Amino acid sequence: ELVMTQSPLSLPVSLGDQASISCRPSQSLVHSNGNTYLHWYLQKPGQSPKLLIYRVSNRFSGVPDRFSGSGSGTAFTLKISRVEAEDLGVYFCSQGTHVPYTFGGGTKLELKRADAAPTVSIFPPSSEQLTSGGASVVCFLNNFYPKDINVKWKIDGSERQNGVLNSWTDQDSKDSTYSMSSTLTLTKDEYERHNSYTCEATHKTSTSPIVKSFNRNEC
């Protein structure tokens, strides 16, 4: 079974730079007819994949000349001479020579912008929710870079947490930053017995945590 092995699995580059993706099959990809059916696909986030390059180096329709393929035998590469935000997405190499046709793992491309600190904002549960016996406290850490971030929850400064959900968005093509929501889910009862609720996030853009809290008795 044809195994395609791509590297890197993650490829971060600054706009205007060059990216290079490597794909290695486990057998020769030369068909009985002499042609080598190795293709490259792109899956922009939110869409179906799309043929980018066919037969190693041929650009499909609508593919700018920045993209280019080369390769022979068991070593195939894809070069993007000058990257930009629209190139954002996942790249796949594939073989259409041997049945089953197989694909690589992909290489997600991310644009390397400058670091940006999060805009942290915290919300207390809502009267409607508090009514249903539940209580979620959410914290948005919007527009930051890099993606790496740790967020700690602290009820009364003591209880650190565990009933938390973290959700990250994908790189945002306009500004290439990320955003995440951390949600601490409690019961009305549990919530009602505490006063301070803190959201603390550590990001490399700062020596100290970005703290955001709300007290139930403030005003």
């Binding site: 042609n35 179906s48 994949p49 259409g96 046709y101 915290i122 919300f123 959900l165």
Partner: protein
């Protein structure tokens, strides 16, 4: 102008069977292969098989022999794939693509969710800042869409005017139901005078709920 159109999202109980369509237009249907690929988050893309409308000749990846069943109606220019005895491993996004020596045109994708979980509308909750919180050129607000099933909820913001800075967070599974959130950022000059509302649609229970941010 080649195009493959697929049927819509499915939620099936374990042990059931589903049939997905792929209406091809813009080329001569029977001279090209219809490929079927499976995408499951984490497993990349996995080729399932292929049929040639015309001869009705099929090629199946071994693991799918007995599981997937290709069929094609040349009268209607429609390709079909049945998936028998659904299993959780069957929950993924299935694609149909056109084929000769490449898969040059792909369909939009058909999500199949195999679960025993009943369909559930979401509970939308407004999220406004608390006392002793907000100040600044802008205010961030949000809506908490919680407890729905199956997947796919669309949340729209109908703010006064100046706004956008919208963010939608991927849904997660919590106790067997999904939960997602969306945030928007409008200038304080305008809020709370100009009204901000999030509209949340969940096509599976055919429910659309609005929630004004107070």
């Amino acid at each position: 102008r080649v195009q493959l159109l697929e049927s819509g999202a499915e939620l099936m109980k374990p042990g059931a069977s589903v049939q997905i369509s792929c209406k091809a237009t813009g080329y001569t249907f029977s001279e090209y292969w219809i490929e079927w690929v499976k995408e499951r988050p984490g497993h990349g893309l996995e080729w399932i098989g292929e049929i040639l409308p015309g001869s009705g000749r099929t090629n199946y990846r071994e693991k799918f022999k007995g599981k997937a069943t290709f069929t094609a109606d040349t009268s209607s220019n429609t390709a079909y794939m049945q998936l028998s005895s659904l299993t959780s491993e069957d929950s993924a996004v299935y694609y149909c693509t056109r084929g000769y020596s490449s898969m040059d045109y792909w369909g939009q994708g058909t999500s199949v969710t195999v679960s025993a979980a009943k369909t559930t509308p979401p509970s939308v909750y407004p999220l406004a800042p608390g006392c002793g919180d907000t100040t600044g050129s802008s205010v961030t607000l949000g809506c908490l869409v919680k407890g729905y099933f199956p997947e796919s909820v669309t949340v729209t913001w109908n703010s006064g005017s100046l706004s956008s800075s919208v963010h939608t967070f991927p849904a997660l599974l919590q106790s067997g139901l999904y939960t997602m959130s969306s945030s928007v950022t409008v200038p304080s000059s305008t809020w709370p005078s100009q009204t901000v509302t999030c509209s949340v649609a969940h096509p599976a229970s055919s429910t659309t709920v609005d929630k004004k941010l107070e």
